[PDB]
Design a protein around this ligand. Structure first.
Ligand SMILES: CC(C)Cc1sc(N)nc1-c1ccc(P(=O)(O)O)o1
Ligand SMILES: CC(C)Cc1sc(N)nc1-c1ccc(P(=O)(O)O)o1
Ligand SMILES: CC(C)Cc1sc(N)nc1-c1ccc(P(=O)(O)O)o1
Ligand SMILES: CC(C)Cc1sc(N)nc1-c1ccc(P(=O)(O)O)o1
Lengths: 317, 318, 317, 319
């Protein structure tokens, strides 16, 4: 039987005997993602070029407005906003949402794949809503995932029931369920990181990557891929297996990627798919944040690959 | 004034006092590219999944093949998808030879990586009965070439003698809008692009050049690395941002990996028309005289100062 | 604040403390309607004409399959099917749906507006579901409405809370709420019927139309409009006011339109909009059907216009 | 073999050994029509209703056609239903063609989602004078091309030229007009009549008598069916596809009719005649009227020839 994201979300909410608030949140996010996709694919660009005589900001506006009007949220943290956004009293629900509305858009001028990343938390205290409600470890996530605006548009949604992938059919604006309860390969054959900054690598990263290129045994060297857009690289890791790295170094002891709306959602998807996600020192999902924009190192993907990295990392610890 | 690809192609044909045959070819190709984009973005996939109770690379080849055949402008067609050249039936023959990759990068379409269509257009040069040999011309001889990138948005890059022009597909109206005119690549970039998984097989010249990008001998900032693994995506980035793209020979691909006729030559033509460079290491890509329609070539291309720097390192290793 | 069909249907179900079954029904119908619209606008027609080297049937298949897979229905009545469809036991819910999947499609060859009409009943009994469960008067409707595939695509949905109109934004495949709690004009200035049957008209119809052309109170004559597609003509009646008539004639002595999936849903929309719908002898919604494809005469629209027709009708007994 | 509007127009221009100017005109119009279709179907309406936290369609449509035709470099004089005076194209963009068009016909009733359309007629400038409004004052029989786009259940472009009438369906998945009906001809006699019978009290006696013959046939035949969408493009297209007759005649209150000669009557009359149909004012062929004002009105009775001819017999019977 055919299944849509709308039908899937609703049925999961009915199974859980929810009140319907999270379902409305998720319906609203889905509508925003379709609107971002339409804009990313440049529908209407002819009018900008005068036929009748901003993208990251627009994407942030779509998600903010759709989530606010769901009546399901109370605190919203965006890559694009300096402070947490507090929902007006009359529209407050119980959920906290952290999101990157257009990840990878810094290089959107070359039409590289971009994406939307989100993580949904339940507000934990009855206090007046504030940034502190967003300072939860990723292990508290209720749902998380991403939309990839690639060759096609796909929404990957992870919850307690596992990871499910929905393809956007732009003819009818419906996300069609195409991959159910997806699991990552135990060991991959691809490594992904920016090797241009090798002179800054921690010695452990240098040694691990050298082992991927010059394997000590009779195995084939891994292939390399680095799109430079986190959603594209993490999605490829999910589909094909392997390892994605944005690790710490001495000039960046906490990494570069942001914990709340990049690392934690992707770490959550990975673990629900049977993968792993580490800072080197601990699981990404166990980090307790103190700053809504704080950075975290991240190494994620197939467990045998992540564990091999940790073996090398501890050798230099 | 707004300009569409349709209007742009027609006016170039008018200025050249052509008979309209090449205009019909390019209009047919534009229609095929829009149909491929729609399919690549999965329009109608719900029907495939049972909403009412071909492979993408094969469909794309069928779209390009049929639109070019029915243009009456072509006589010989070479596709990545076909072992032998397709010879157009006599009554539909025109004078052009088209080599193309209808869905470049589609081997990894399962992870929704950017894919593209690459094409190069030659005039038939021989007066013989049309055959596979008519596609064996050096890239030197191209009349027009370019690619469609099905990335975050769909763009067509078209190169001819008048230069390189970039058109964005507006999917609301199915129209290619001219958005970047007479494009030129940066003289020198800050990004290098290659699969470093083959580091163990690199010739010394490639190894040293990449070492220079990571550890600059002059203490400037290291280049950033990018490698999508889809040639159209990596080359388009090289065009837009500058830098260098490399697919050199390795042990699995001793003649290189990329295909000369419908990957290297079109991209090399776009690059040179944009003020860039494209070399095999030994010679300009466009000077290679092919002997086989699916033959491979090593390729190093992008900003002129970056390729020239590579070539100096190459000469240092004889 | 923006509102979608998805969000509106979900919120009405929450206010009603429903189990979510009707919501799944309506979302499934929403998906089918977008797919029908896509096909009606001829998306993909180039593939039929050889670019790479039935509509009424497809429309029925879309509605049938989406409703079956909702797990919300037990009996399905379509204009396209001789007998009622009984849903298999594992997919049964409690709702009975009568629909015309592509109303007006007989003239789709001239690109006239066409539509989808639907009416939803609740099955209350523990008997095994059968065709007889669809033999209900329209006053039993839980929800009803129509999708119009006209110059744009609009879904009109009627329930106890009133009538609401949703515009399909095809860039994102989302129905946008654009007209809330719609009420029809008390009196219009347009009458709609096929005057080609003037020779067969009952004396009451003839006299009523004479009053529209030569007004007894010295008012200006009504304008005439007859698209010949029931959904187009009735939607215009809703938006602009006035009257729509399909009375008995010699080829159709019980009228021509179908009671179950044409007259009843439109009569329901009209009454929920403050309008009226009569057979001449009684309200459409009070007719007790004996055959799922039985026909009925219908006069519907603005209340003053229908009441005026009924005055003429009562004059002729 | 599949054929698109772009390819068909280009090949017709090649067959005629044209310079390509008319081809550029038509490509530009095709682009405008796709943009109108997109807006008519309400793409992006979610943004107007606040999804991220403005012109009426008839104005946008006029702006689209005006700008696309200007930038074709193929036109010199433009007449629109929306503009009191003809637009004279600035010198650097001038071509030889005169275009009269209605950018969104029937749009006054667009609020009920009734079918709407675009109508156009293309002339060559005949005078050696500086271009002016007078260059649009040509009889319809001078038309080089004419036709219409109907934004109905699907969007179709009907294009008439000397080679006949051809119908192209817009495939919105790819923005291509697909040739679906070639060298169209209308039925010799139909079974539908189309006019606003609510104003029967104002009818001319000939019209009254003719419509009476359709409802109460004297020859024991079946009465005609009635259809009246109230959008000219929709009613005329149905007349082309199914046959029959469409009427907006002159009456006692409107001695010149209501529809506009230059950009409503002439193009539809031209399409009709190229399809083997007829189009008359009652007194003469629409295509023979020589206009004196670009917004002048004309009565129109058009469609299947046996029906128009029957109408004219009744009309002449009443002198
Ligand atoms: C395990 C999953 C996340 C449960 C789901 S899945 C969905 N659509 N809704 C819920 C849910 C539970 C409670 C509530 P609520 O009372 O806050 O709405 O919703
Ligand atoms: C420099 C460019 C390639 C010239 C162009 S650009 C276009 N649309 N057509 C032509 C062209 C020249 C000759 C012919 P033809 O007589 O084969 O048709 O066409
Ligand atoms: C008055 C309106 C129609 C009530 C609505 S509105 C909506 N979306 N659902 C319902 C509803 C009631 C009962 C059930 P259920 O337990 O069969 O699902 O649903
Ligand atoms: C009979 C038809 C109208 C001929 C056609 S059909 C088309 N696409 N162009 C032309 C045409 C003739 C002259 C010119 P021009 O030199 O003004 O461009 O064009």
């Amino acid at each position: 039987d055919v299944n849509t994201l709308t039908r899937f979300v609703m049925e999961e909410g009915r199974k859980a005997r929810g009140t319907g608030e999270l379902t409305q949140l998720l319906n609203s996010l889905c509508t925003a993602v379709k609107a971002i996709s339409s804009a990313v694919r440049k529908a209407g660009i002819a009018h900008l070029y005068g036929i009748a005589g901003k993208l990251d900001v627009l994407s942030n506006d779509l998600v903010m407005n759709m989530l606010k009007s769901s009546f399901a949220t109370c605190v919203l943290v965006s890559e694009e906003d300096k402070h947490a956004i507090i929902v007006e009293p009359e529209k407050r629900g119980k959920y906290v949402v952290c999101f990157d509305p257009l990840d990878g858009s810094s290089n959107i001028d070359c039409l590289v794949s971009v994406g939307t990343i989100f993580g949904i938390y339940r507000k934990k205290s009855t206090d007046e809503p504030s940034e502190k409600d967003a300072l939860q470890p990723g292990r508290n996530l209720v749902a998380a995932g991403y939309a990839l605006y690639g060759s096609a548009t796909m929404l990957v949604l992870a919850m307690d029931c596992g990871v499910n992938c929905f393809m956007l059919d732009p003819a009818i604006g419906e996300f069609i369920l195409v991959d159910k309860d997806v699991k990552i390969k135990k060991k991959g054959k691809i490594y992904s990181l920016n090797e241009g900054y090798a002179k800054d690598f921690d010695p452990a990263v240098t040694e691990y990557i050298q082992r991927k290129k010059f394997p000590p045994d009779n195995s084939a060297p891994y292939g390399a891929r680095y799109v430079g857009s986190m959603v594209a690289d993490v999605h490829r890791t999910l589909v094909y297996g392997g390892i994605f790295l944005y690790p710490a170094n001495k000039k960046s002891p906490n990494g570069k990627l942001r914990l709340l709306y990049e690392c934690n959602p992707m770490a959550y998807v990975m673990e629900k798919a049977g993968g792993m996600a580490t800072t080197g020192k601990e699981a990404v999902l166990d980090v307790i944040p103190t700053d809504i924009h704080q950075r975290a190192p991240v190494i994620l993907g197939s467990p045998d690959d992540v564990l091999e990295f940790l073996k090398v990392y501890e050798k230099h610890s």
